[PDB]
Amino acid sequence: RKKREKEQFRKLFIGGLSFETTEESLRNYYEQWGKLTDCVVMRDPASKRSRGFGFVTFSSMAEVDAAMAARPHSIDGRVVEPKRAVAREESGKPGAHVTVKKLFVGGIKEDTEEHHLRDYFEEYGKIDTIEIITDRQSGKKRGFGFVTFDDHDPVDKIVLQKYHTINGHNAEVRKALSRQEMQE
RNA sequence: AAGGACUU
């Protein structure tokens, strides 16, 4: 059980697969960034036709990071779409598979500043913007903000890490989804 | 296109 939990954080969803792509061609491509412990092309039960996506599982979260740092990836003559895998047990939550560049950061109360967030989050990727939300009339800080990156992957890594302490606060960090996006 | 045992 315990291993399985670990490897969930070492797994990439690979979508946009050529219908020619196999486990072997998938494994050949991703082995350039690490040692794979699993690799699967998901297929229709009846037809065995590729569902156009799969998973690869690496030996560490570092090897995942190295693979994602080397996008774009093309395999069997297609640029594919690699994404950190959402666990099956959370893949029915609203918004779970929605890919965004914006992060919601809550639980930061009144003392937390832009620079706190810039600081804490800059190590994860390139930040475009940072907004701390304040009341419209009173300008009282409402205790949350948003960080937008230039790429969705930082956001995926951040949220998957789950626990974050920011300016002495246990923050709630999630994707910042629109109402539309929340219907996915 | 979001997980293999659709493997009683």
Side-chain angles (χ1 to χ4, degrees), chain A residues 41-57:
Chain A
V41 177
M42 284 296 20
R43 282 157 187 103
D44 182 62
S47 69
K48 301 289 88 114
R49 203 173 154 287
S50 167
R51 296 174 55 195
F53 77 94
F55 298 94
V56 304
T57 306

Side-chain angles (χ1 to χ4, degrees), chain A residues 103-114 116-117 121 130-136 138-147 164 166-167 169-174:
Chain A
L103 189 80
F104 161 79
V105 188
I108 55 175
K109 320 299 262 295
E110 293 202 60
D111 59 354
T112 299
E113 304 279 24
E114 189 163 324
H116 286 106
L117 300 185
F121 283 115
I130 299 167
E131 320 154 62
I132 300 294
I133 310 307
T134 53
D135 192 64
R136 54 132 48 193
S138 60
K140 296 220 60 150
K141 283 178 160 189
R142 284 175 61 202
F144 60 96
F146 305 91
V147 182
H164 300 282
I166 304 173
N167 188 34
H169 303 294
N170 292 184
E172 209 60 22
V173 315
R174 251 118 64 183

Side-chain angles (χ1 to χ4, degrees), chain A residues 63-164:
Chain A
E63 295 169 332
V64 177
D65 286 336
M68 300 295 287
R71 282 168 299 152
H73 297 163
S74 52
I75 306 184
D76 291 328
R78 256 178 137 282
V79 185
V80 283
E81 206 216 325
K83 301 186 261 195
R84 291 175 198 257
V86 189
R88 311 149 208 230
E89 30 290 293
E90 329 198 345
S91 290
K93 285 178 193 172
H97 296 146
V98 180
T99 294
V100 296
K101 296 185 181 159
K102 189 179 216 165
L103 189 80
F104 161 79
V105 188
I108 55 175
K109 320 299 262 295
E110 293 202 60
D111 59 354
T112 299
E113 304 279 24
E114 189 163 324
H115 83 262
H116 286 106
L117 300 185
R118 173 268 286 120
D119 214 73
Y120 178 85
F121 283 115
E122 67 186 1
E123 98 185 55
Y124 288 95
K126 205 72 186 313
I127 284 157
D128 277 5
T129 77
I130 299 167
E131 320 154 62
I132 300 294
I133 310 307
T134 53
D135 192 64
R136 54 132 48 193
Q137 320 90 24
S138 60
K140 296 220 60 150
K141 283 178 160 189
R142 284 175 61 202
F144 60 96
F146 305 91
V147 182
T148 306
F149 297 82
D150 76 348
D151 178 25
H152 68 88
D153 189 56
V155 174
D156 293 337
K157 180 168 154 163
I158 291 162
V159 299
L160 286 162
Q161 287 185 340
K162 201 177 169 161
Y163 303 116
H164 300 282

